Design an enzyme around this catalytic site. Structure first.
Site, PDB file in Angstrom:
ATOM      1  N   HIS A   1      17.801   0.511  58.865  1.00 21.67           N
ATOM      2  CA  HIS A   1      18.319  -0.173  57.700  1.00 21.67           C
ATOM      3  C   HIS A   1      19.613   0.477  57.326  1.00 21.67           C
ATOM      4  O   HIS A   1      19.682   1.696  57.193  1.00 21.67           O
ATOM      5  CB  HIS A   1      17.315  -0.060  56.526  1.00 21.67           C
ATOM      6  CG  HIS A   1      17.665  -0.877  55.316  1.00 21.67           C
ATOM      7  ND1 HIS A   1      18.157  -2.160  55.389  1.00 21.67           N
ATOM      8  CD2 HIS A   1      17.503  -0.620  53.999  1.00 21.67           C
ATOM      9  CE1 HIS A   1      18.320  -2.646  54.168  1.00 21.67           C
ATOM     10  NE2 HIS A   1      17.936  -1.729  53.307  1.00 21.67           N
TER      11      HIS A   1
ATOM     12  N   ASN B   1      21.309  -0.519  47.784  1.00 21.91           N
ATOM     13  CA  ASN B   1      20.595  -1.294  48.757  1.00 21.91           C
ATOM     14  C   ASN B   1      21.020  -2.747  48.562  1.00 21.91           C
ATOM     15  O   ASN B   1      21.794  -3.057  47.643  1.00 21.91           O
ATOM     16  CB  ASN B   1      19.081  -1.104  48.508  1.00 21.91           C
ATOM     17  CG  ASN B   1      18.213  -1.548  49.644  1.00 21.91           C
ATOM     18  OD1 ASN B   1      18.675  -2.002  50.693  1.00 21.91           O
ATOM     19  ND2 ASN B   1      16.921  -1.423  49.436  1.00 21.91           N
TER      20      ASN B   1
ATOM     21  N   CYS C   1      21.397  -6.436  56.790  1.00 23.06           N
ATOM     22  CA  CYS C   1      21.831  -5.197  56.077  1.00 23.06           C
ATOM     23  C   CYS C   1      23.056  -4.471  56.650  1.00 23.06           C
ATOM     24  O   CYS C   1      23.848  -3.906  55.886  1.00 23.06           O
ATOM     25  CB  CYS C   1      20.671  -4.185  56.014  1.00 23.06           C
ATOM     26  SG  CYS C   1      20.019  -3.636  57.660  1.00 23.06           S
TER      27      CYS C   1
ATOM     28  N   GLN D   1      20.310  -9.567  50.701  1.00 17.28           N
ATOM     29  CA  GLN D   1      20.301 -10.051  52.089  1.00 17.28           C
ATOM     30  C   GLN D   1      19.240 -11.130  52.337  1.00 17.28           C
ATOM     31  O   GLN D   1      19.324 -11.888  53.315  1.00 17.28           O
ATOM     32  CB  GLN D   1      20.093  -8.897  53.049  1.00 17.28           C
ATOM     33  CG  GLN D   1      18.708  -8.255  53.026  1.00 17.28           C
ATOM     34  CD  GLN D   1      18.659  -7.016  53.879  1.00 17.28           C
ATOM     35  OE1 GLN D   1      18.999  -5.937  53.429  1.00 17.28           O
ATOM     36  NE2 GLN D   1      18.205  -7.164  55.110  1.00 17.28           N
TER      37      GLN D   1
END
Lengths: 107, 241
Positions: free
Chosen positions: B174, B204, B42, B36
């Site tokens: 997040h 992630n 995110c 990102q």
């Protein structure tokens, strides 16, 4: 007291005075503000002490950034560079990292 | 509107499953880790990733889709200043799906205008389902990778390997992907016996040099009801069939 608007300014301060630095900061991206080495601690504790705090936004969105407060107290006379870089700690800085500097001048 | 119990009946049936381990990385369910960068996007990476997974899983199609289009074009979300997972999926339905990122690349926080016609064929969803917080393992096993919220601190940024041992954020902040669960037997140096240590496996969006090649293991328990740092408080899975 101090914000991004003061980047590169010299502030006149007294030995023992607290300077609040407030900088936008988004931990959801992995970035934060660091002294060289990837630490929140003072380069030199004899010159100035640093405390640090993140404050989340009142937004409940995912990815909304907050604010880092650095509370800097000058401990000796002199003009002291407080140099921060906005970076990921596993990557380190590059040419194009956002940097913040303020000089704290105590007589 | 979509009911979890009605959907799970369809996809699971009466099929039982091992609560110790199931990893979509090994069953053609997880597309590459992306980054990102310096941009609060995110929400888009998590939700796009989960759509990418469903195409791999249900259609045997590897496709990488445009987070940038969601960033530029999702009016319910706020681009680089944040968004919500469910809102993202709503906007994908409204937009008619999303371009491949080859036709609509990621430019992070660089200024960019929404253009909903950058490719000949968009990749859509039908709807999305909310997963109850006590059904994450079942939902993973039978439905696929889940877009979830987590409360991250700066300890997350220093995570390298193993099962995460750091502090939680103050607030859910997040969006990530839940891609599986696992278990590792580790000898207790006092009892001299192996103990089972369960974890969730998260993808992630901080690049592949973060964590375990972009992934993080987070402590759970056998049932999966243990949710460290508010993991899966929001939990949504897109359905493309």
């Amino acid at each position: 007291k101090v914000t991004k608007a003061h980047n590169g300014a010299t502030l006149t301060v007294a030995v023992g005075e607290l300077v609040e630095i407030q900088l936008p900061s988004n931990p959801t991206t992995g970035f934060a503000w660091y002294f060289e080495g990837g630490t929140k601690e003072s380069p030199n504790e004899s010159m100035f002490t640093v405390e640090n705090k993140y404050f989340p936004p009142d937004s409940k969105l995912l990815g909304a950034g907050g604010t880092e407060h650095f509370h800097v107290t000058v401990k000796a006379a002199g003009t002291h560079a407080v140099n921060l870089t906005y970076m990921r700690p596993w990557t380190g800085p590059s040419h194009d990292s956002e940097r913040f500097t303020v000089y704290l001048k105590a007589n | 509107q979509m009911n979890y119990e009605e959907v799970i009946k369809k996809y699971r049936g009466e099929e039982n499953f091992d609560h110790a381990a199931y990893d979509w990385r090994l069953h053609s369910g997880v597309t590459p880790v992306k980054d990102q960068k310096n941009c609060g996007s995110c929400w888009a990476f998590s939700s796009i990733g989960s759509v990418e997974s469903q195409y791999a899983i249900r259609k045997n199609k590897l496709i990488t889709l445009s987070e940038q289009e969601l960033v530029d074009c999702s009016f319910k979300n706020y681009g680089c200043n944040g968004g919500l997972i469910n809102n993202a999926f709503e906007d994908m339905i409204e937009l008619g799906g999303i371009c491949p990122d080859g036709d609509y690349p990621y430019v992070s926080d660089a200024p960019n205008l929404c253009n909903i016609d950058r490719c000949t064929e968009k990749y859509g969803i039908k709807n999305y389902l909310s997963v109850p917080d006590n059904k994450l393992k079942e939902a993973l096993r039978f439905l696929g990778p889940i877009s979830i919220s987590v409360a991250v601190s700066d300890d997350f940024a220093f995570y390298k390997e193993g099962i995460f041992d750091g502090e939680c954020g103050d607030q859910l902040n997040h969006a990530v992907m839940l891609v599986g669960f696992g278990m590792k037997e580790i000898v207790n140096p006092l009892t001299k016996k192996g103990e089972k240590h369960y974890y969730y496996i998260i993808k992630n969006s901080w690049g592949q040099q973060w964590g375990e090649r972009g992934f993080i293991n987070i402590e759970t328990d056998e049932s999966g009801l243990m949710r460290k740092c508010g993991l899966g408080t929001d939990a949504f899975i897109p359905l493309i069939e």
